[PDB]
Amino acid sequence: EQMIQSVDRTAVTGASYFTSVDQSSVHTAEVGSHQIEPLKTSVDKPGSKKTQGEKFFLIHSARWLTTHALFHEVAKLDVVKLLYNEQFAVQGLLRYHTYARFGIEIQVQINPTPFQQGGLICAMVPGDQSYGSIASLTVYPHGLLNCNINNVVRIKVPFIYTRGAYHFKDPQYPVWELTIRVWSELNIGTGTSAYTSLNVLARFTDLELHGLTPLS
Amino acid sequence: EQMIQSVDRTAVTGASYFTSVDQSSVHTAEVGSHQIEPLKTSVDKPGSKKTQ
Amino acid sequence: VQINPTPFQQGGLICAMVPGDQSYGSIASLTVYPHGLLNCNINNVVRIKVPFIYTRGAYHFKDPQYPVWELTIRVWSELNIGTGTSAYTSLNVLARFTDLELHGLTPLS
Amino acid sequence: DDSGGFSTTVSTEQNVPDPQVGITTMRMDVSGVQAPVGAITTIEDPVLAKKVPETFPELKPGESRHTSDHMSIYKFMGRSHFLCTFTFNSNNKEYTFPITLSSTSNPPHGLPSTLRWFFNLFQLYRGPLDLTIIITGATDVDGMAWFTPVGLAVDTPWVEKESALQIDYKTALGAVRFNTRRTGNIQIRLPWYSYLYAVSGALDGLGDKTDSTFGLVSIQIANYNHSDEYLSFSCYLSVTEQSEFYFPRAPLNSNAMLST
Amino acid sequence: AVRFNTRRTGNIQIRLPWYSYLYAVSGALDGLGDKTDSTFGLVSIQIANYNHSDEYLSFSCYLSVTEQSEFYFPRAPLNSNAMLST
Amino acid sequence: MMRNETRVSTTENVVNLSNYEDARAKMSFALDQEDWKSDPSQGGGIKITHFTTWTSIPTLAAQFPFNASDSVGQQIKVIPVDPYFFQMTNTNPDQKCITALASICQMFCFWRGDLVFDFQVFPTKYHSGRLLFCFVPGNELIDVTGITLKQATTAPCAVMDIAGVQSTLRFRVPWISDTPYRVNRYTKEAHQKGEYTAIGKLIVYCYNRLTSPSNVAHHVRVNVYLSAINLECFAPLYHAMDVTTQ
Amino acid sequence: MMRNETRVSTTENVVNLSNYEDARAKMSFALDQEDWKSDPSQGGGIKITHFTTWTSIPTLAAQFPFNASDSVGQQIKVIPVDPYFFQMTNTNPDQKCITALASICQMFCFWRGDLVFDFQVFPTKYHSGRLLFCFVPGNELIDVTGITLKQATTAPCAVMDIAGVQSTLRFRVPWISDTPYRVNRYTKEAHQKGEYTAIGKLIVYCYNRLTSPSNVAHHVRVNVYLSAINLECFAPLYHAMDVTTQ
Amino acid sequence: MMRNETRVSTTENVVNLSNYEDARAKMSFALDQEDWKSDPSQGGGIKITH
């Protein structure tokens, strides 16, 4: 007695979210295998979530003048809304997912000549620049920019929010809010440049992505 | 390779004289179980062939 | 519960055992009871086994309070045919006792 | 088999009560590299319908951040819910209301919003309940409340009138004596005194007027009143740890959920 | 609910449970996040048998904090023009 | 000379109706302060202690046909992904058929968990077609009818071959949200940006057309069931739901 | 600085008259809060702690003659099977003779157990006959007079030869019911299908005729006693019974 | 015969709003008198006690 094998009827295939139940199935027909390149055409590491989402992006460029008075607000920007734009590489991950949970890395850069003098403050305020005191902005995660000492500050913050995640298509309120206030006025002499340029870099850290969706 | 189980086609059920052969069968769905009475509503022995 | 469709028919039924009364509860929640689904493509026999559920200790046949069990069979998906196919299917319900206890033999019926 | 039956198939238990604790806790991932075989199934087979569902790669939800479990009956219905309210209008009167589990009795003469929903989720109820009454209105009013089981002589339900019973019959059933100036509240148990196994809500016919009610609370007031002042009582039911619930049932539809 | 009478007690010391669908509530918000994520609960009182001819009735509420509560992420305090009273 | 004095604190003679530790009774009508034992005799041993007994039961919520006269990519039906969804009703008697998941979840403020949709088809052995079940994460108010069939494969989706030996596809929806819980907003009457009931909408597409002979019916009906796994609800209230007329 | 505060809960100053744990006294008229010892001196050591002292006593309930002028199969007497049955009364003084079982059982809502009927005959050594004691299970309202003598042997029954060295037959009735308990319905005034007091009726038949000489009396009288074994009653009330006038 | 009597002292039904030992609650709106656990998930572990 010999047994004649037949084709299998029921099977479940897919890749981790598409599930296909088939009443009439068949085995897969594969030719070849995966090959390595002994002479590589690209020597960088291949693309992933880490090298596309966790990378610095320029989000804002302001300019600090000698006519701005004390406590004048040079930059008032929502950090997460500016990273949600088509011109950045992180949009390709955020356009199709619904919720996220992330940390933020900020780097603020200025360039004075050493004939100038003055100061700035760069505080990370969560949610809202509310009725709190301007003179108490050193309670937040902050950084002081002095024209004599440094020209780069960098801040690292975790996820602080009233819910479990952030909804990009229809947000409740902004997660973080960066403010840059004039902490001491910019003074020059005769002939010195009456300005200095400012740039803000931002990136995600520990990016979690949930619920891929068709509608944008 | 995973096996997807299906419902059984042929089965024979009944109680000792009624025999039912089924070409399309399914398992029995039972809720609960048989319970005893700790406070009995009848204290005689139950009916049988001997007492009737 | 037994039915017999030809395989050119399509539709469905539900066969739930409801104790006492088909009360104000939901028709769409009949899968909470001990039930069985009859699909014209898959099966044609369902079988259910239930214990004794009642507010008293026994059941009085000569003068009952209320019925112990109540079987309902609702149309769960409509019966559709083509041209020339039989526009009906027959249905039959079989029942039996299990673990039968009998008390108090009496002369009057 | 005891009953003499026989079968070539396997009979399994369907819809087992309490399959999961309704708090987020841990009893890696939930789904993983292995292909999900539980996505496709047959619902007409009660054996194959007990298969755990998965279709997408997930991971563990973690743990919740509150201690209690709100999805338990003994903590949900431990909160005392509204039962009835009524007012008095004259002197030496007596009011009588039963605690009827039946869904046929519509409110105000029946179970209101949350208690009507809960006592039609299951078939059988057995055990003692937990009554709290609240006095609102007049002062210097002496009142007496007692409990009568079903099957015994008592005044007409849901009607305020003079009492046809004597003081020897009222105080033999067990009664409390209060005054509306001192307390304003009574938290009293209700004993399980019935001749039958359990009471049910979803019944019709003469089984609805016999096996639905389990007890009956009535209140008589004296020393009311002076010239112009109202007197209002409100009742609230809670559930105890001695009570039991049997045979889950299909819930009420959206047209039977009624309130006061 | 609780049921009281104004002749016997004159005070009620009652807990307030943490029943919310979100993680935590915040104070310093604007927009539609101010009307959603600020409130956490809501207490309401109904009275009966009031009144006779001429008499007033006044209620006053007081909040305390418990050991089950938590506080996160310190913030810059309010300025001297937002500190207001009744 | 006895020395036993206590100070009468605040909240004197106040009724707390919020939990069992303050609503339990002080005295008893029962003689001898007695207690009652367990008797699982006439109840079959089926005892309920937890509300997962009803929520883990798949009960019917929707009903839609898959006609042969619809085009490829046409959206057949859209479902808001929340336990408050049901649309079935009955004529005699006049009633609105609740589900077992919408009866338990309507008595709470906040819900959380993984919803499990079950799609049971009723073909013959001779119809042939496919459906596409897509899940767009978001909320219950997003403009979702502009999504084409090719755009719907960006979202997490699953296909289903209709005719076969199995009939039911179980579609466990993952919990995708920005907030940890999600509020029962149906008590209110006005909308507010930020508070929602659903975690997105679920679309059903015509993936392949329905081929069939002439002596069978030209449509296949699909039932939609609704249960929940890893369900968590808290903060009770009272509310009676209504038919989602879509 | 002392810190001793309590919150005054609900049910403030409420009298619970339902059990001893809430009806026991808070203070005492007695000097030194004293207690009393046991003294079974003038009481003979006969101390009562339980109500089975009265219910297990067989006391007389009925009285019927067995004439010589009745036919075979004629129903002599019918008895409803419940502890509330008695029919004897006295003339001087005017009174209604309760039984010891109907005095205890009238003070409860629900009863349960096995009733024991005792039939004591008073013949000479010269009468000769038999009786048939039949038990028809059911309730206190069934049409029972159509049952013939041959039909009565379907039910559980027992015969008794009258003249002999023994005089009493004990007829222990088994508990046959659909409900676990049985309600005291005599407080009410209208009937209701489903709630009952008895578990059936008991018929007495003329099995063989009464043969006797000419110098003895032409009838034999039978006393009926009434007690209970395995008796259980709960849910107290107050009720005063009445003579079953049949 | 029970013997349980106490003497009602001074300051009867007085609200002390000065410390937590006299301002803590006597009863609770929560079901089952329940308690809540710690959850430092969305707060970054930055907890203030002083």
Side-chain angles (χ1 to χ4, degrees), chain A, chain B, chain C, chain D residues 1-27 29-260, chain E, chain F, chain G, chain H:
Chain A
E1 180 68 29
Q2 293 180 357
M3 185 63 73
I4 299 169
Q5 64 182 357
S6 65
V7 69
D8 291 330
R9 299 295 296 164
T10 62
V12 174
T13 60
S16 178
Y17 288 100
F18 182 77
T19 301
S20 178
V21 177
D22 292 330
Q23 297 294 322
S24 66
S25 178
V26 74
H27 294 88
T28 62
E30 183 179 1
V31 293
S33 66
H34 187 272
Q35 297 294 321
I36 62 170
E37 290 180 353
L39 183 63
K40 296 180 177 67
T41 62
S42 296
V43 299
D44 57 351
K45 60 175 70 175
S48 67
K49 185 177 71 67
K50 183 174 72 67
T51 190
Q52 185 176 1
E54 286 82 0
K55 188 174 74 69
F56 286 101
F57 297 110
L58 182 64
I59 61 170
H60 185 73
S61 295
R63 192 182 65 188
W64 177 42
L65 299 172
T66 62
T67 61
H68 301 294
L70 185 64
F71 291 159
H72 184 81
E73 192 168 10
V74 177
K76 183 179 185 294
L77 57 93
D78 191 3
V79 178
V80 186
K81 186 180 287 292
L82 291 174
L83 290 172
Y84 186 72
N85 195 359
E86 185 181 1
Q87 62 188 356
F88 301 111
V90 75
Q91 183 65 38
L93 297 173
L94 299 177
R95 187 176 183 270
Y96 296 100
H97 291 91
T98 305
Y99 297 105
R101 184 174 180 268
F102 54 88
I104 297 298
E105 174 70 27
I106 295 296
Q107 185 175 2
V108 179
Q109 294 174 356
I110 42 94
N111 280 316
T113 184
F115 287 181
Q116 291 175 354
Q117 66 186 5
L120 290 173
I121 193 167
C122 298
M124 290 294 290
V125 179
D128 190 7
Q129 185 62 257
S130 179
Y131 292 102
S133 177
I134 305 302
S136 296
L137 286 173
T138 62
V139 181
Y140 299 106
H142 67 279
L144 294 174
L145 288 169
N146 191 357
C147 295
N148 198 5
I149 305 299
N150 54 0
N151 53 3
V152 175
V153 293
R154 58 181 65 87
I155 306 167
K156 187 185 288 185
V157 290
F159 188 74
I160 306 297
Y161 196 71
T162 52
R163 296 175 186 271
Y166 180 72
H167 192 192
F168 294 100
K169 295 180 288 183
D170 194 1
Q172 298 289 318
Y173 65 95
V175 178
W176 292 104
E177 182 177 1
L178 181 141
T179 183
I180 295 171
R181 306 298 290 264
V182 175
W183 195 250
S184 180
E185 295 181 355
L186 187 64
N187 297 115
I188 62 170
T190 61
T192 312
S193 296
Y195 62 94
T196 180
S197 180
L198 189 147
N199 285 317
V200 178
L201 295 172
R203 72 182 178 92
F204 294 103
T205 59
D206 294 331
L207 184 62
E208 294 178 354
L209 293 172
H210 297 286
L212 59 91
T213 186
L215 60 92
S216 296
Chain B
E1 180 68 29
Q2 293 180 357
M3 185 63 73
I4 299 169
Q5 64 182 357
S6 65
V7 69
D8 291 330
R9 299 295 296 164
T10 62
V12 174
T13 60
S16 178
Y17 288 100
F18 182 77
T19 301
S20 178
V21 177
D22 292 330
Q23 297 294 322
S24 66
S25 178
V26 74
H27 294 88
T28 62
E30 183 179 1
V31 293
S33 66
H34 187 272
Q35 297 294 321
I36 62 170
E37 290 180 353
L39 183 63
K40 296 180 177 67
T41 62
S42 296
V43 299
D44 57 351
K45 60 175 70 175
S48 67
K49 185 177 71 67
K50 183 174 72 67
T51 190
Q52 185 176 1
Chain C
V1 179
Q2 294 174 356
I3 42 94
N4 280 316
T6 184
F8 287 181
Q9 291 175 354
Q10 66 186 5
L13 290 173
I14 193 167
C15 298
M17 290 294 290
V18 179
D21 190 7
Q22 185 62 257
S23 179
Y24 292 102
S26 177
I27 305 302
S29 296
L30 286 173
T31 62
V32 181
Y33 299 106
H35 67 279
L37 294 174
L38 288 169
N39 191 357
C40 295
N41 198 5
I42 305 299
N43 54 0
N44 53 4
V45 175
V46 293
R47 58 181 65 87
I48 306 167
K49 187 185 288 185
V50 290
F52 188 74
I53 306 297
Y54 196 71
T55 52
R56 296 175 186 271
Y59 180 72
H60 192 192
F61 294 100
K62 295 180 288 183
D63 194 1
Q65 298 289 318
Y66 65 95
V68 178
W69 292 104
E70 182 177 1
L71 181 141
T72 183
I73 295 171
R74 306 298 290 264
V75 175
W76 195 250
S77 180
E78 295 181 355
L79 187 64
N80 297 115
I81 62 170
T83 61
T85 312
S86 296
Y88 62 94
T89 180
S90 180
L91 189 147
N92 285 317
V93 178
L94 295 172
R96 72 182 178 92
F97 294 103
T98 59
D99 294 331
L100 184 62
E101 294 178 354
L102 293 172
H103 297 286
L105 59 91
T106 186
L108 60 92
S109 296
Chain D
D1 186 74
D2 197 4
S3 296
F6 61 94
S7 179
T8 62
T9 62
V10 178
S11 66
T12 59
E13 186 176 2
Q14 187 178 6
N15 298 324
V16 177
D18 305 336
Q20 190 181 6
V21 179
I23 197 68
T24 302
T25 185
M26 292 180 183
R27 65 180 177 88
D29 292 331
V30 176
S31 299
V33 183
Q34 186 66 40
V37 72
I40 189 68
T41 187
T42 299
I43 200 167
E44 290 86 6
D45 195 1
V47 179
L48 295 175
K50 293 188 287 183
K51 190 184 288 185
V52 178
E54 72 270 12
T55 184
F56 287 152
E58 297 179 358
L59 53 89
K60 293 181 176 67
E63 290 180 354
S64 179
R65 291 298 182 185
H66 61 88
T67 302
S68 297
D69 186 74
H70 290 270
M71 293 294 287
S72 179
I73 283 95
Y74 294 100
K75 293 181 181 179
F76 180 79
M77 295 301 291
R79 178 174 292 174
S80 184
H81 295 91
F82 181 72
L83 181 62
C84 66
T85 183
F86 62 97
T87 63
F88 288 97
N89 289 318
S90 295
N91 194 0
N92 296 114
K93 296 293 181 68
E94 190 270 334
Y95 187 78
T96 298
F97 64 97
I99 303 98
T100 306
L101 298 183
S102 179
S103 178
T104 305
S105 296
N106 290 319
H109 292 172
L111 287 176
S113 64
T114 308
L115 293 177
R116 187 175 181 178
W117 174 72
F118 179 72
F119 287 106
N120 293 115
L121 291 175
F122 56 91
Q123 183 66 40
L124 300 175
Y125 177 71
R126 181 184 182 274
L129 279 179
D130 190 80
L131 183 65
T132 71
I133 63 171
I134 291 172
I135 298 98
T136 300
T139 187
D140 288 329
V141 173
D142 187 74
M144 182 178 70
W146 62 95
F147 180 75
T148 303
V150 291
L152 297 176
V154 77
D155 291 329
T156 62
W158 300 104
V159 174
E160 178 181 358
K161 67 180 180 67
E162 294 290 328
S163 180
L165 299 173
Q166 69 271 16
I167 194 66
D168 291 330
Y169 183 76
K170 295 175 184 177
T171 62
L173 294 171
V176 297
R177 183 67 61 88
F178 62 94
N179 193 359
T180 63
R181 188 180 62 84
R182 291 182 180 92
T183 173
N185 52 357
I186 292 96
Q187 292 182 353
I188 184 67
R189 294 287 292 271
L190 295 175
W192 180 248
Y193 288 162
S194 293
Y195 61 95
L196 45 89
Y197 174 77
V199 290
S200 180
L203 295 175
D204 280 334
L206 53 90
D208 186 75
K209 64 179 72 174
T210 301
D211 296 333
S212 295
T213 61
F214 68 99
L216 189 145
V217 177
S218 63
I219 300 170
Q220 184 181 3
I221 53 97
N223 202 3
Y224 184 84
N225 52 3
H226 293 285
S227 66
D228 285 325
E229 185 66 28
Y230 64 96
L231 182 63
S232 298
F233 291 169
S234 296
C235 300
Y236 293 91
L237 285 176
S238 179
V239 79
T240 62
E241 71 272 14
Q242 298 296 110
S243 67
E244 290 175 353
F245 304 102
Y246 293 99
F247 196 82
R249 188 178 173 86
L252 291 174
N253 50 15
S254 296
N255 289 114
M257 289 186 284
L258 295 174
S259 66
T260 60
Chain E
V2 297
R3 183 67 61 88
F4 62 94
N5 193 359
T6 63
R7 188 180 62 84
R8 291 182 180 92
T9 173
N11 52 357
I12 292 96
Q13 292 182 353
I14 184 67
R15 294 287 292 271
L16 295 175
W18 180 248
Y19 288 162
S20 293
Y21 61 95
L22 45 89
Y23 174 77
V25 290
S26 180
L29 295 175
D30 280 334
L32 53 90
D34 186 75
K35 64 179 72 174
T36 301
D37 296 333
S38 295
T39 61
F40 68 99
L42 189 145
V43 177
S44 63
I45 300 170
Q46 184 181 3
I47 53 97
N49 202 3
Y50 184 84
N51 52 3
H52 293 285
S53 66
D54 285 325
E55 185 66 28
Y56 64 96
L57 182 63
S58 298
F59 291 169
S60 296
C61 300
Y62 293 91
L63 285 176
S64 179
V65 79
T66 62
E67 71 272 14
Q68 298 296 110
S69 67
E70 290 175 353
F71 304 102
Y72 293 99
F73 196 82
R75 188 178 173 86
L78 291 174
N79 50 15
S80 296
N81 289 114
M83 289 186 284
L84 295 174
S85 66
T86 60
Chain F
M1 182 178 72
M2 62 177 287
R3 299 293 295 163
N4 288 317
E5 62 182 1
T6 58
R7 184 178 63 84
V8 175
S9 296
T10 60
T11 66
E12 191 269 330
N13 196 2
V14 176
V15 183
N16 192 3
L17 294 171
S18 297
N19 52 4
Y20 183 72
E21 290 86 4
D22 288 330
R24 62 183 180 179
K26 305 297 184 290
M27 55 183 73
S28 179
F29 279 151
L31 190 145
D32 205 2
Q33 296 292 109
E34 65 182 1
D35 293 332
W36 289 266
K37 292 181 181 180
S38 179
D39 194 1
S41 67
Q42 307 294 321
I46 300 99
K47 185 172 73 175
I48 301 100
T49 58
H50 201 274
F51 285 108
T52 315
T53 308
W54 291 271
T55 64
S56 66
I57 304 300
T59 59
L60 179 138
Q63 179 71 253
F64 65 98
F66 175 63
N67 292 317
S69 66
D70 55 355
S71 66
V72 173
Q74 179 177 357
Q75 297 182 358
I76 298 168
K77 192 169 178 62
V78 61
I79 302 299
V81 181
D82 52 353
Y84 301 99
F85 178 75
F86 68 101
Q87 70 179 4
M88 289 292 106
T89 186
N90 195 1
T91 61
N92 288 318
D94 286 325
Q95 60 182 350
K96 295 186 285 184
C97 295
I98 203 75
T99 63
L101 185 60
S103 294
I104 305 299
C105 294
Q106 69 182 355
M107 298 296 172
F108 293 99
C109 291
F110 300 101
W111 68 273
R112 186 180 185 272
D114 292 331
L115 296 178
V116 178
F117 291 168
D118 298 332
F119 295 98
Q120 182 183 2
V121 298
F122 294 96
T124 63
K125 295 180 177 67
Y126 294 94
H127 296 93
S128 187
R130 288 178 190 270
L131 294 172
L132 180 62
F133 298 99
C134 179
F135 173 70
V136 178
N139 52 16
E140 70 268 13
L141 52 97
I142 46 172
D143 289 329
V144 81
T145 59
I147 295 169
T148 320
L149 183 62
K150 289 182 181 180
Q151 296 179 358
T153 60
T154 299
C157 63
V159 301
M160 181 181 176
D161 188 72
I162 298 300
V165 295
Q166 290 87 18
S167 64
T168 303
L169 183 141
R170 299 181 70 89
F171 191 83
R172 181 176 178 178
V173 175
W175 177 254
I176 302 300
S177 179
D178 54 353
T179 60
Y181 295 99
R182 187 71 67 187
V183 70
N184 190 1
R185 190 185 54 80
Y186 292 106
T187 306
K188 293 176 71 68
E189 291 86 4
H191 291 88
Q192 183 69 42
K193 183 177 179 180
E195 58 181 3
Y196 296 103
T197 57
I199 60 170
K201 289 192 284 188
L202 185 139
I203 315 167
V204 178
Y205 289 93
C206 182
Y207 187 74
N208 284 317
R209 294 179 70 186
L210 187 65
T211 62
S212 65
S214 65
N215 53 3
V216 296
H218 295 88
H219 63 276
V220 175
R221 289 184 177 92
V222 180
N223 288 331
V224 178
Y225 296 95
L226 175 58
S227 67
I229 193 68
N230 295 116
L231 186 64
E232 180 180 0
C233 296
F234 69 99
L237 52 75
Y238 176 74
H239 182 71
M241 284 300 296
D242 196 1
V243 168
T244 301
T245 61
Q246 68 182 359
Chain G
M1 182 178 72
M2 62 177 287
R3 299 293 295 163
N4 288 317
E5 62 182 1
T6 58
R7 184 178 63 84
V8 175
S9 296
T10 60
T11 66
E12 191 269 330
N13 196 2
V14 176
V15 183
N16 192 3
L17 294 171
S18 297
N19 52 4
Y20 183 72
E21 290 86 4
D22 288 330
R24 62 183 180 179
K26 305 297 184 290
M27 55 183 73
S28 179
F29 279 151
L31 190 145
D32 205 2
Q33 296 292 109
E34 65 182 1
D35 293 332
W36 289 266
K37 292 181 181 180
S38 179
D39 194 1
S41 67
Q42 307 294 321
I46 300 99
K47 185 172 73 175
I48 301 100
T49 58
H50 201 274
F51 285 108
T52 315
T53 308
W54 291 271
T55 64
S56 66
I57 304 300
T59 59
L60 179 138
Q63 179 71 253
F64 65 98
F66 175 63
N67 292 317
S69 66
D70 55 355
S71 66
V72 173
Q74 179 177 357
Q75 297 182 358
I76 298 168
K77 192 169 178 62
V78 61
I79 302 299
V81 181
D82 52 353
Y84 301 99
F85 178 75
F86 68 101
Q87 70 179 4
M88 289 292 106
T89 186
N90 195 1
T91 61
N92 288 318
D94 286 325
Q95 60 182 350
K96 295 186 285 184
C97 295
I98 203 75
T99 63
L101 185 60
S103 294
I104 305 299
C105 294
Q106 69 182 355
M107 298 296 172
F108 293 99
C109 291
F110 300 101
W111 68 273
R112 186 180 185 272
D114 292 331
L115 296 178
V116 178
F117 291 168
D118 298 332
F119 295 98
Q120 182 183 2
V121 298
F122 294 96
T124 63
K125 295 180 177 67
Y126 294 94
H127 296 93
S128 187
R130 288 178 190 270
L131 294 172
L132 180 62
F133 298 99
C134 179
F135 173 70
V136 178
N139 52 16
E140 70 268 13
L141 52 97
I142 46 172
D143 289 329
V144 81
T145 59
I147 295 169
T148 320
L149 183 62
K150 289 182 181 180
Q151 296 179 358
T153 60
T154 299
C157 63
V159 301
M160 181 181 176
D161 188 72
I162 298 300
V165 295
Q166 290 87 18
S167 64
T168 303
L169 183 141
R170 299 181 70 89
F171 191 83
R172 181 176 178 178
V173 175
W175 177 254
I176 302 300
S177 179
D178 54 353
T179 60
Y181 295 99
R182 187 71 67 187
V183 70
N184 190 1
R185 190 185 54 80
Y186 292 106
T187 306
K188 293 176 71 68
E189 291 86 4
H191 291 88
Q192 183 69 42
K193 183 177 179 180
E195 58 181 3
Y196 296 103
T197 57
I199 60 170
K201 289 192 284 188
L202 185 139
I203 315 167
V204 178
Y205 289 93
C206 182
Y207 187 74
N208 284 317
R209 294 179 70 186
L210 187 65
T211 62
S212 65
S214 65
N215 53 3
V216 296
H218 295 88
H219 63 276
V220 175
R221 289 184 177 92
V222 180
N223 288 331
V224 178
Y225 296 95
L226 175 58
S227 67
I229 193 68
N230 295 116
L231 186 64
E232 180 180 0
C233 296
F234 69 99
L237 52 75
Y238 176 74
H239 182 71
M241 284 300 296
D242 196 1
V243 168
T244 301
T245 61
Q246 68 182 359
Chain H
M1 182 178 72
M2 62 177 287
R3 299 293 295 163
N4 288 317
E5 62 182 1
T6 58
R7 184 178 63 84
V8 175
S9 296
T10 60
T11 66
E12 191 269 330
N13 196 2
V14 176
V15 183
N16 192 3
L17 294 171
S18 297
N19 52 4
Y20 183 72
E21 290 86 4
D22 288 330
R24 62 183 180 179
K26 305 297 184 290
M27 55 183 73
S28 179
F29 279 151
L31 190 145
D32 205 2
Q33 296 292 109
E34 65 182 1
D35 293 332
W36 289 266
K37 292 181 181 180
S38 179
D39 194 1
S41 67
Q42 307 294 321
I46 300 99
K47 185 172 73 175
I48 301 100
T49 58
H50 201 274

